[PDB]
Structure 1
Amino acid sequence: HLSLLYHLTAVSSPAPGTPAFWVSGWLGPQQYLSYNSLRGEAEPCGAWVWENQVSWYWEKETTDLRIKEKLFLEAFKALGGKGPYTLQGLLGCELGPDNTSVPTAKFALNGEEFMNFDLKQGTWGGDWPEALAISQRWQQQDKAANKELTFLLFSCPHRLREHLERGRGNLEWKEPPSMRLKARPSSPGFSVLTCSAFSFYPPELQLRFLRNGLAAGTGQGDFGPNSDGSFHASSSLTVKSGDEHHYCCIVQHAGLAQPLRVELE
């Protein structure tokens, strides 16, 4: 954080109507980019459509991902066999504490991390024979290692700084959650208390339960996105029936000036 990360996926037997290869691009927790092999164009997402960009910004994104499309689809040929295969890549960068770029280049096969790009040697490496086979295929493709080096060491940090400058407001966005605390009957003698946080950003948020002002744990929680890129969270706690009104929930979130106490409805 704040990272610029590309999430790349290829599948060797895509379902009809779905892409063999697709990419989502992320600025921290926000999706800024979409790309798939059926359309062949990198596109901005959401608020980033209105970002003021340098000339040829999205043309350069498209060029880079078309190259990665070919490389990913070529990787299946190096494995042979029927499969099916999923190849994933996590490529990108983040600014370190001394304001320089820190690269990320990891890959997984059928959900298992198995390969990385070594930026010192400029080579793909991994212990599995599948890693060696794909590495060798990529390593002997015309200047693919050099383009990967440039993508990670130059293009990514340049793009990240551009977005940090031109989209600073989008990334500093703070929307406080709407809160609800409700109880429902459960097993005999027991109720489930649920504290829910609606439509907030950034995603970092804490929910805590109190029983008579005293800490009663965090409960069992989960979190997810909404369709606009805001977020949702909830935490639930099993309590004794008839004891529900001794409890409250506390939320901590950057959109709020102080932790907010939430009382039972």
Structure 2
Amino acid sequence: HLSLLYHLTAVSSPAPGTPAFWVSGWLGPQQYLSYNSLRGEAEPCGAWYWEKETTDLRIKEKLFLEAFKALGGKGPYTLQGLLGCELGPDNTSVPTAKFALNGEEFMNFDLKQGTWGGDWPEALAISQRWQQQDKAANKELTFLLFSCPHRLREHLERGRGNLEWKEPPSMRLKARPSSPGFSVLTCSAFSFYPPELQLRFLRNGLAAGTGQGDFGPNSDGSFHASSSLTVKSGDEHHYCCIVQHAGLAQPLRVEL
């Protein structure tokens, strides 16, 4: 929330027709941008000039593929990057520049000396190649220190609409039997936004537990949640499910 993040991935051995490099652009918990090596253009997403973006990402595309060049050795390799910033409490922007190799963090960008750093040999290899790219590190520094907070602030202005979005969840509470002598109570929340939701169980007014619950997205950007709790058969009606969400004027109680 109040953060602009680009999720970058490049793979050395893409499957046929698949792109070697793709990026997702996120404004808080919402995706607004998408890009990939195949198309070569930055496209908008879910209800969200643009050139400054399709270019910035084209340069990034070159760098990620370039990283495979002097990593050498038979892959396959998966290079990931996290680039962005977030407005902090004091209206201060905090940048993010982390990199992963085959799922493991190994590189970062040091604002102090303005370069990518890390101890792994491969980080030393990639960092050195990137330093040799025309103005690459200057652009990195410039984006984390200036371009990012700026674009963030702009999207916040010209896009306050989708950020103030509020969708209360449709609740459902069902009881089903599991292991002998017990039933499992499942409390589900459907199609809500923002993503911050909270479920808790109560037992005849008493504070019960916060069951085992998953959480996930829906094709439209809204979310889904559910929480399960195991209770003794016949003790079901003694429970209530309480949900707290920004789209509700007050905590909603759900009975069987």
**3-state SS of 1:39 partner:** coil
SS of aligned partner of 2:60:
helix
Cα distance in 1 for partners of 2:116, 2:82 equals: 13
SS at match of 1:221: coil
Distance 1:214 1:15 in 2: 55
Tell me by how many angstroms 1:174 deviates. 1.0
For residues 112 and 20 of structure 1, the distance between their equivalents in structure 2, rounded to whole angstroms, comes to 19
The one of 204, 215, 218 equivalent to 1:226 is 218
* Residue among 77, 80, 103 paired with 2:69: 77
Matches of 1:86 and 1:231, distance apart in 2 = 29
Could you give the per-residue CA deviations for residues 16-58 of structure 1, whole angstroms, max 9, x where no partner exists? 12110000000000001000111010111011xxxxxxxx921
**1:187-234 Cα shifts (integer Å, max 9, x gaps):** 111111100000000000100011111111100011000000000000
SS in 2 for 1:79: coil
Structure 1 SS opposite 2:108: strand
Q: Distance in 1 between matches of 2:168 and 2:4?
A: 25
What is the distance in 2 between the residues matched to 1:39 and 1:92?
23
Deviations 1:132-186 (A, max 9, x none): 1100010111110011112222221111111110111210111100000001111
Q: Any stretches of 5+ residues in structure 2 without a counterpart?
A: none
- Name the count of aligned residue pairs: 256
Residue-by-residue CA offset, 1:81-123 (whole Å, 9 max, x unaligned): 1110000000001112232321110000000011001112110
TM-score (norm 1): 0.94
Offset, 1:15: 1.3
- Local SS of the residue matching 1:98: coil
State the identity %. Answer: 100
Which of these residues, 177, 181, 187, is aligned with residue 189 of structure 1? Answer: 181
Aligned partner (choices 136, 147, 166) of residue 128 of structure 2:
136
Q: Comparing 89-98 with 105-114, which one deviates more in the overlay?
A: 89-98
**1:78 CA displacement:** 1.5
Distance across 1 between alignment mates of 2:125 and 2:164: 43
Matched, 1:46 2:46: yes
Using the TM superposition, name which of 15-24 and 92-101 deviates more: 92-101
User: What is the TM-score of this pair, normalised by structure 2?
Assistant: 0.98
Mapped to 2, the partners of 1:192 and 1:97 lie a distance apart of: 42
Q: How far, CA to CA, are the matches of 2:38 and 2:247 in structure 1?
A: 39
Residue matched to 1:261: 253
Q: Distance in 2 between matches of 1:115 and 1:184?
A: 48
Which whole-Å CA distance do the structure 1 matches of 2:166 and 2:49 have between them?
A: 27
Runs of 4+ with >4 A deviation: none
Q: Look up the SS of the partner of 2:70 in the other structure.
A: helix
Alignment partners' CA distance in 1, 2:137 and 2:38: 26
Give the Cα–Cα distance (whole angstroms) in 2 for the partners of residues 195 and 230 of structure 1: 18
2: distance between equivalents of 1:220 and 1:257? 26
Q: Secondary structure at the match of 2:7?
A: strand
Q: Which residue of 1 aligns with 2:13?
A: 13
- For the aligned residue pairs, the C-alpha RMSD in angstroms reads 1.3
- Residue in 2 aligned with 1:118? 110
